[PDB]
């Protein structure tokens, strides 16, 4: 998966304790860590069927596809959409299967930088919209949590446990992603 | 309710369209407006049992009480916790019953400034922790969304509709709150 740099990212300027307290604010506990790995066993094979709702040339993508497009021409960039689709398709399983350690925290900071003007488009060598407004990143917290709920419904509390933990993770990384957008001592 | 200024706040530096498309990014539609206004009939009488979960002199909030406390002594301020609890009790019904128009958006921007160092503690004349880090504001999206689900039970899809719409409201409220925190051109 080109551009996918899980395990090759630099040390995010967020301390492990600060990260530990973010997972606590979102109430991400051992029960959720288990439920996440349970959703990973549930969603590993439906990844492509999840993706067709979220990103791709044959998926859908709402008006947010503009940030997948050339800003001068408003032209959706296909390989931009294809390479992010693959990276995003792997992130679904990384959100469920990977341990939320420093290497996870550092990669989430990577994903946050890739939405920021600090690195957007650089991963794919694409000339695109330079920066995604933080308001939409936070606004995206809901749809990208609610889309997964029908998927974990395969084979109550299991579907609620897997749902809440993903909800917790979808919040948690965006809370990390805010730091590049946020003023120095404001994050 | 002292300091409660819904309808008395200044114009947020967010345009109506920017707000209107923020409401779409969170997918808050007329069906949610109904479920929200339906949730108001569900939550109007359980406010005290919700408030005691989230804010109060007899409510617990982990390290979140620190931001309700004096920074020099770490001592929770009673008048701070009671005056915000009342305002929070009104926001529960404002989240459900009030129309999400400009007058609504401006007060949400007010609540965000009251978490920011721009206005925190000023509303209540209290000397407190000057600023709440945005990372916890976003992290708080989950707990303050997930607590409402058990209350919305009495008076499936109805409680799912009210819950998702509440989730949508908690997210959309935080995205506006980020603007005072977010760097100039990053929100």
Automatic annotation (TrEMBL), chains A, B:
Pfam families: Protoglobin. InterPro entries: Globin-like_sf, Globin-sensor_dom, Globin/Proto, Protoglobin. SUPFAM superfamilies: Globin-like. This is Protogloblin ApPgb. It comes from Aeropyrum pernix (strain ATCC 700893 / DSM 11879 / JCM 9820 / NBRC 100138 / K1). Residues 17-186 form the Globin-sensor domain. GO terms for molecular function: heme binding; oxygen binding. It comes from the Archaea.
């Amino acid at each position: 998966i080109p551009g996918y740099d899980y395990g090759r990212v630099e040390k995010s300027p967020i301390t492990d304790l600060e990260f530990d307290l973010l997972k606590k604010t979102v109430m991400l506990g051992e029960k959720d860590v288990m439920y996440l790995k349970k959703a990973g066993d549930v969603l590993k094979d439906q990844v492509d069927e999840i993706l067709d709702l979220l990103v791709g040339w044959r998926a859908s993508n709402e008006h947010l596809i503009y940030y997948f497009s050339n800003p001068d021409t408003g032209e959706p960039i296909k390989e931009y959409l294809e390479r992010v689709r693959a990276r995003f398709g792997a992130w679904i399983l990384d959100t469920t299967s990977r341990d939320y350690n420093r290497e996870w925290l550092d990669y989430q900071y990577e994903v946050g930088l890739r939405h920021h003007r600090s690195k957007k488009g650089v991963t794919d060598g694409v000339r695109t919209v330079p920066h995604i407004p933080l308001r939409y990143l936070i606004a995206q917290i809901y749809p990208l949590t609610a889309t997964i709920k029908p998927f974990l419904a395969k084979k109550p509390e299991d579907i609620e446990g897997m749902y809440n933990a993903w909800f917790k993770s979808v919040v948690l990384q965006v809370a990390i992603w805010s730091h590049p957008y946020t003023k120095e001592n404001d994050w």
